[PDB]
Amino acid sequence: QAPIAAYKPRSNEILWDGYGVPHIYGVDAPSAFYGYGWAQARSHGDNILRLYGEARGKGAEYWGPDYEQTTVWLLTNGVPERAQQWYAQQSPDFRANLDAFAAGINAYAQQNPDDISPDVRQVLPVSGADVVAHAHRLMNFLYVASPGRTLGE
C-alpha cells in the first residue's frame, strides 16, 4: 500500500506553530528554500549572520580580537576561498536552492530591519556562497579538523 497523498502547495506561505515551528510550503523547490531562509532569519537571525560573518573570514574585521583566532584559522585553511569554489562547483538546480535560501535571509532583514541586531547588520547582504562556507566550516573545520586539535591549545 502506497503512502498518503503528497500535498501540492498552490501558493507560497509559511504556517507557523504555537511553538514557533514553521511549516514552509512552496510551489517549487527554490521557493521552499527561500521560505526556509526567511524562517531561520526570523528565529535565529542574529547568530546565523554572525556565523556567516566568521565563515567569510571576516570575524576579526566585523567584531574584533575575540574573533581573531577563528579568522586566522579559517584563512590559513583557506575556507572562505574554498567556499567560493564549492559554490561555483554546485549543480545549477542546487545552486539555485542555495541562492534562494540566501535571498530569504536577506528579504527577512530588509523587511524586518528592527527584528535584527546592530553588530551583524554589516554582514547582511549574504550569499549562497556564505551558506556553503559556513557549512564547510562546520563540517570540516569544527567537526572533522578542529583548531584545538591541530593547535594543541
Binding site: 503528497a6 509559511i14 504556517l15 535565529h44 542546487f94
Partner: protein, 520 residues
C-alpha cells in the same frame, strides 16, 4: 549522541521506528538546532538542523527519516614538521615552504580597523601552524574536494527508496557521522559514514597524534569508498543503534568484528555505560510500540552504581567514620535511578568522579575490565575497595561543599532553567549510564546546576501510514531577543510531555498561529 532504528519484525504494529536524539552544547551557537517542515509539490521533510544550514540533517517524512551521531571519523591528520634551514626536512632533504601573503582587517574598539598581515605557509601536507610551544604542525584535511555535502544530505533525506538513499550516501560528500536510517518499506540501516584517508600502516591512536612529517611515507592521498566502511542493514537482531560507542555493537547479534576493518577507522575502546544501556534497551525488548519505544528513551539508570555499589557498600559499612557508614546506607537504599527525588545520586556522582575520573570514563578502578565478549556487562566490580572507600570519604566532603548536604534531592540541585522557567531535572551523565543525557554544569553557590549539554532535539517516529511522530526541543525554536519560543518547551521536557509533530496539511491548517505569505 543517541540513535535507534527498529525493523518491522521487532515491532507490535509492523512499522519501523526511529529515534533522533543528538546531544550538543545548549549554548554554543553553531550547534543550535532548529526544527522546521518544508513542503513542495515534489518533496517533504520535517526535522532539526544546525542554524545556518539550508538542509535538515535530522529529518523524516511519510516515507523515511535519518539521524546522526558523532563517530569522530579521523578525516585530518596533523603532521609534526622537522623545520630546518627555512624549510622542512622531508624524505632526504630540506624542501622550501609554499608561502602566500594574506591579510585581514581587525576591528579596533574605536570602530576603526587596521590591516593585519598574515603569512600562510604550507608544506606538501597542508597549512602550517606554530603551536604555543613551537611545534610546527601541518594539517592535512581529507575531503576538501567534496563540494556536494549539502546536496548529498538533501538528495539523501528526499530519497524515494533505500536504494536511491544509499546511492546518495555513496557520493562520500558528508565527511563524518554515524548515520542511521529507516523506511515505511521496512529497511533500517546504520552507516559509519565519513571520508577516511586510505593508509598503509597505523593504529587509529597513531593517526590521531602528531604523525611524522619528515616522510612521504605518511602522506596519504586517497580515501575509502562507502563500501569499505562499517555498515549494517536489516540485521538478524532487528535493530541498529549508536550512542557514540565505537561501531562494534551496532546491532546485537553482531554482523562483523574489529578484525574486519582497517584499525585506523574507529577505536577499540570500552563502550559507554550509556552505549551498553542502548544495546540492552533494544535487544531485550520485542513487539515495541511507539509508546514503549518512547518510554525506553527516557531511561535514566545509574548503571555505574550497578557495577560498583555491591563491592563498594559493604566496604564502606565497616568504615569507622559514622558518616561514611551513613553515606553507604543512603547509597544502599537508592533504587539507582537519577530521578528528581533521589537523595543518593548527587553523592554517587561525586564518588564516581573520583573513582572514574572527572568525565566518568576511566577503567582503572573496576575489578574485571571491559571486554567485547561481554560488551554490555563488563566493566564491573571495585578493584581496591579500601581505596574506593577513602574516595567515598573525600566525596562526602565534596558533595557537602558543593550542595550543602549529602542527601539533597537530585532534582532540587539539578534544574532546567530558561528565562523565567525553572523546572526540576531528572536523568544525567551519559557516562554513568543514563541513556537520556543532561550533562549538568558545576553548581553555583546555592548548589543549583543546569544542563551545559545533553538532550536538544528528540523525536521518535513510527513509519506507519500515515506516519506518527512526537518530539521536543529543550531550548525551544528560537533564541532571538524577546521570543516566546525560547523557554517554551523546557517545562514539557521536565515532564517528558512530547508534542505530536505535525506533517499533514490538515494538522498544520489547524495549529496555525503566526502566518506569513511570501513570493520569491
Amino acid at each position: 549522541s543517541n540513535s535507534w532504528a527498529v525493523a518491522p519484525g521487532k515491532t507490535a504494529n509492523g512499522n519501523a521506528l526511529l529515534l533522533q536524539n543528538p546531544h550538543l552544547s545548549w549554548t554554543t551557537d553553531y550547534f543550535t538546532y532548529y526544527e522546521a517542515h518544508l513542503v513542495t509539490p515534489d518533496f517533504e521533510i520535517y526535522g532539526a538542523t544546525q542554524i545556518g544550514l539550508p538542509v535538515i540533517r535530522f529529518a523524516f517524512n511519510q516515507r523515511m527519516g535519518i539521524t546522526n551521531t558523532v563517530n569522530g571519523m579521523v578525516g585530518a591528520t596533523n603532521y609534526r614538521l622537522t623545520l630546518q634551514d627555512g624549510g622542512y626536512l622531508y624524505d632526504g632533504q630540506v624542501r622550501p615552504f609554499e608561502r602566500r601573503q594574506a591579510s585581514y582587517r581587525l576591528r579596533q574598539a574605536d570602530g576603526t580597523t587596521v590591516d593585519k598581515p598574515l603569512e600562510i605557509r604550507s608544506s606538501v601536507h597542508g597549512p602550517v601552524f606554530e603551536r604555543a610551544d613551537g611545534t610546527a604542525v601541518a594539517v592535512r584535511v581529507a575531503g576538501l574536494d567534496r563540494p556536494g555535502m549539502l546536496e548529498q544530505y538533501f538528495d539523501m533525506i528526499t530519497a524515494d527508496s533505500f536504494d536511491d538513499y544509499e546511492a546518495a550516501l555513496a557520493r562520500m560528500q558528508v565527511p563524518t557521522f554515524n548515520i542511521v536510517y529507516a523506511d515505511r518499506e521496512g529497511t533500517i540501516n546504520y552507516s559509519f559514514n565519513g571520508v577516511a584517508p586510505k593508509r598503509a600502516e597505523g593504529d587509529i591512536a597513531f593517526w590521531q597524534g602528531l604523525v611524522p612529517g619528515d616522510s612521504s611515507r605518511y602522506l596519504w592521498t586517497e580515501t575509502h569508498p562507502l563500501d569499505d566502511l562499517p555498515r549494517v542493514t536489516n540485521p538478524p537482531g532487528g535493530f541498529v543503534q549508536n550512542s557514540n560507542d565505537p561501531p562494534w555493537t551496532p546491532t546485537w547479534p553482531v554482523t562483523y568484528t574489529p578484525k574486519d576493518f582497517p584499525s585506523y577507522l574507529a577505536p577499540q575502546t570500552p563502550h559507554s555505560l550509556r552505549a551498553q544501556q542502548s544495546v540492552r534497551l533494544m535487544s531485550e525488548n520485542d513487539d515495541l510500540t511507539l509508546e514503549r519505544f518512547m518510554a525506553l528513551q527516557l531511561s535514566h539508570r545509574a548503571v555505574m552504581a550497578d557495577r560498583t555499589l555491591p563491592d563498594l557498600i559493604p566496604a564502606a559499612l565497616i568504615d569507622p567514620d559514622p558518616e561514611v557508614q551513613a553515606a553507604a546506607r543512603l547509597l544502599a537504599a537508592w533504587d539507582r535511578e537519577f530521578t528528581s527525588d533521589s537523595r543518593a545520586a548527587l553523592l554517587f556522582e561525586e564518588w564516581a568522579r573520583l573513582f572514574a575520573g572527572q568525565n566518568f570514563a576511566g577503567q582503572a578502578g573496576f575489578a574485571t575490565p571491559w571486554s567485547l565478549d561481554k560488551p554490555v556487562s563488563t566493566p564491573y566490580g571495585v578493584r581496591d575497595p579500601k581505596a574506593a572507600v577513602d574516595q567515598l570519604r573525600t566525596a562526602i566532603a565534596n558533595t557537602k561543599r558543593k550542595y550543602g548536604a549529602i542527601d539533597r534531592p537530585f532534582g532540587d540541585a539539578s534544574r532546567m532553567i530558561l528565562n523565567d522557567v525553572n523546572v526540576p531535572g531528572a536523568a544525567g551523565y551519559g557516562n554513568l549510564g543514563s541513556f537520556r543525557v543532561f550533562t549538568w554544569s558545576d553548581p553555583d553557590e546555592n548548589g543549583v546546576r543546569t544542563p551545559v549539554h545533553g538532550e536538544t532535539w528528540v523525536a521518535m517516529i513510527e513509519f506507519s501510514t500515515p506516519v506518527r511522530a512526537y518530539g521536543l526541543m529543550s531550548y525551544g525554536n528560537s533564541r532571538q531577543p524577546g521570543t516566546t519560543h525560547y523557554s517554551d518547551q523546557i517545562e514539557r521536557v521536565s515532564r517528558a510531555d512530547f508534542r505530536e509533530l505535525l506533517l499533514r496539511r490538515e494538522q498544520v491548517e489547524a495549529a496555525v498561529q503566526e502566518r506569513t505569505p511570501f513570493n520569491f
